[PDB]
Ligand binder design. Structure first.
Ligand SMILES: O=CCCCC[C@@H]1SC[C@@H]2NC(=O)N[C@@H]21
Lengths: 270, 66, 86, 181, 79, 91
């Protein structure tokens, strides 16, 4: 009776386009290549799944990701049967990774598990800073995480003091010594460390988002020419001729052609 | 009344004109054909446009309409 | 060289019908036509070996062979210019 | 016949009391163009400019039937020199060139002290070089959690496109909202 | 052609996640409360602060600033 | 004011009825000097040469008070010129 309202001929076209583009990202593809029905047991968000594969990988649990999912289920019952999405999923995320790293189990707290140094997120969760679950937590299983402070009970924002945006403007204007937008301001508040690093990289390398993806991840091949559209009818045409052997200073020369002009850049081989 | 100027040509003469124009604070545009992917004058204007992946290498600067 | 497997071949221009590309890795097992010479549509002009597998890269149209960037027993990688044809 | 100007480009950091900076010149573009003589001294790619000599990098000279035209050429030859790996007086000279008082040609030796807005200089811009570096770094040492290998072959992506105009004729849910909340 | 650490037995403190030390907070000879922040360590989207198990005096520190750690590596020893 | 001379450097090989030799430029030395104007065209480092345009590498022009002085500006800046990998009308 009811149909879908859209353009197919055109979605096939969109599809062929991303078919290829996806190719560029194969370094980040998950281990799922089949529908998995044990999902009804894990309950791990679809849009955490591959973000946590990455994460597990980086702490040396690549290959051991199947056990990271077993624990994800077990952690869930530890906590009284909760809803798992950003960021409550992340806390489960971390407590699963953490327990697996440390051949830990549910009994490693119930009269046993003490001085353990739980992740940021997880102590945050029991401090109450993500919220209050329908059914709460289990005192005796929390106590041993936070001991020191106590649970805060009210939703945070009604006691979290307001952020001073004045002081944040003076700060960014000071270090960047320039004009600074409202976007800069909340971006900084939302993400102090990461924002800073974005600035570091930008001073150093300009606006990377114009590079094509393959060049962005891999750079260039000897004899390759690359076009970067910079605006309507403005482009950089860049040819990589060769690279030299590292001189005794660990520095290679890269011979370039940029926009009809011979150029040499020196880069340190790490 | 000229804010922006296009040169219907290549090579030494395009370059020269681009410099005249730049010296009058007039913005510039160059055209190039396909064989001219890499004539320097392409790189000396403020903007530049490929004329035609349709047109002959000789033909690409004679296309009034394009 | 001692062994011309060292040599680097330019990349086939993909949006250009004259350039035949290497569809996969492998080795030139036999050179078959020479530079500047007539061939018909569907002619064998180069025998490659993939993984102990033959396949004979053949001409798309009727042609005068413009260039041949390969000799017998050269290495080849995906996207390499093997031949041109007019 | 007409008029001619000369500027001298120097290693001198115009913000640091005009101190002759030193080092390696890692890049160098001169201009050219009619009515413009370049007289290259230390200025060129590869030179080791030395603590011990006169710091003239280039002597730049221009010529046209009018002062203003000579000025237009100096401004543009300057605007088009790029030297990196050392700070220069170029931003200044440009600013000398655009000054009503210089052009009128009624100026004295006090001209420089009496015009503070000639040191109205902004730290320079370099998008083009900065990119060559990034590509340089990734080609050699590669990207964070990406498998350091030859730039894999990719299938030629054919990218569908619609003109702005057709786009701009469209009336979607965005127009819906602007219309009726 | 980095000493691990002793789980079961002695009050050492082992590395409980592999990453980088972002800041050492307490010097080699020093008194310290129970649960006191000692050491700060960073993994991908993770951050364990380490704390005092006992309430004592620190014998040693086996990491600086910016050091990489593995799981089961010695970082503090307290009585 | 004085005299100006121009000539054109073409890929035409004089030792061949003037036949616009084609191919790649693999070396290029433009001179210049005082009273010299170099208007570069097809003549530069990498990029190669098409059959399908009138052969013009450099337009070379010179200026001094007497004809003699201009001509001797011209020869010098021809002699200083070294283009390679295509032939030229220079000598
Ligand atoms: O920094 C890496 C990307 C973010 C990782 C966590 C994401 S946030 C949305 C999704 N929900 C989770 O708890 N994990 C992933």
């Amino acid at each position: 009776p009811r149909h879908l309202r859209t353009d197919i001929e055109g979605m096939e076209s969109l599809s062929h386009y991303w078919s290829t583009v996806r190719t560029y990202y194969s370094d980040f593809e998950s281990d799922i290549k089949s529908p998995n029905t044990e999902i009804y047991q894990h309950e791990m968000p679809g849009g955490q799944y591959s973000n946590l594969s990455q994460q597990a990988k980086s702490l040396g649990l690549g290959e051991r990701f199947d056990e990271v999912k077993d624990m994800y289920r077990r952690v869930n019952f530890l906590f009284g049967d909760i809803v798992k999405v950003t960021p409550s999923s992340k806390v489960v995320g971390d407590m699963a990774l953490y327990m697996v790293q440390n051949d830990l189990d549910e009994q490693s707290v119930i009269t046993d598990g003490y001085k353990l140094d739980f992740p940021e997120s997880v102590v945050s969760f029991f401090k109450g800073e993500i919220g209050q679950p329908v059914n709460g937590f289990n005192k005796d299983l929390q106590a041993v995480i936070l001991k020191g402070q106590e649970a805060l009970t009210a939703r945070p924002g009604e006691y979290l003091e307001p952020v001073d945006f004045e002081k944040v403007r003076e700060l960014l204007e000071e270090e960047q010594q320039g004009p600074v937008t409202e976007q800069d301001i909340i971006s900084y508040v939302l993400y102090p460390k990461v924002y800073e690093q974005y600035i570091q990289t930008r001073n150093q390398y300009g606006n990377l988002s114009l590079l094509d993806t393959p060049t962005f991840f891999f750079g260039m091949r000897n004899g390759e020419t690359v076009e970067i559209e910079i605006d309507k009818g403005k482009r950089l045409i860049i040819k990589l001729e060769t690279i030299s052997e590292p001189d005794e200073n660990g520095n290679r020369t890269i011979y370039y052609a940029m926009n009809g002009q011979a150029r040499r850049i020196y880069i340190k081989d790490e | 009344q000229i804010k922006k100027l296009l040169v219907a040509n290549r090579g030494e003469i395009a370059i020269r004109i681009f410099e005249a124009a730049a010296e009058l604070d007039i913005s510039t545009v160059a055209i190039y054909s396909n064989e001219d992917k890499s004539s320097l004058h392409r790189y000396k204007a403020d903007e530049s446009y490929l004329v035609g992946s349709d047109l002959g290498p000789a033909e690409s600067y004679l296309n009034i309409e394009r | 060289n001692v062994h011309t497997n060292a040599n680097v071949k330019p990349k086939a221009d993909k949006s250009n019908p004259s350039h035949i590309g290497a569809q996969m890795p492998g080795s030139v097992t036999e050179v078959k036509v020479s530079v500047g010479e007539t061939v018909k549509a569907n002619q064998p002009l180069l025998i490659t070996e993939a993984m102990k597998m033959e396949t004979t890269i053949q001409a798309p149209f009727d042609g005068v062979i413009k260039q041949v960037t390969v000799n017998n027993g050269d290495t080849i990688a995906t996207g390499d210019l093997l031949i041109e044809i007019e | 016949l007409g008029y001619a100007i000369q500027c001298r480009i120097t290693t001198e950091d115009p913000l640091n009391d005009f101190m002759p900076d030193t080092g390696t010149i890692i890049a160098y573009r001169s201009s050219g163009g009619f009515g413009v003589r370049l007289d290259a001294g230390d200025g060129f790619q590869g030179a080791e400019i030395s603590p011990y000599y006169d710091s003239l990098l280039v002597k730049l000279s221009t010529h046209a039937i009018s002062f203003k035209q000579a000025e237009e050429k100096m401004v543009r030859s300057l605007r088009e020199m790029r030297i990196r790996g050392v700070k220069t007086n170029i931003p200044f000279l440009i600013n000398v060139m655009k000054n009503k008082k210089f052009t009128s040609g009624d100026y004295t030796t006090k001209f420089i002290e009496e015009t503070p807005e000639l040191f109205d200089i902004q730290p320079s811009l370099d998008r083009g070089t900065k990119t060559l570096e990034y590509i340089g770094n990734v080609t050699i040492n590669g990207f964070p959690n990406v498998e350091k290998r030859p730039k894999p072959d990719y299938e030629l992506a054919s990218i569908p496109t619609v003109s702005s105009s057709k786009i701009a004729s469209f009336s979607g849910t965005k127009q819906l909202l602007d219309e009726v909340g």
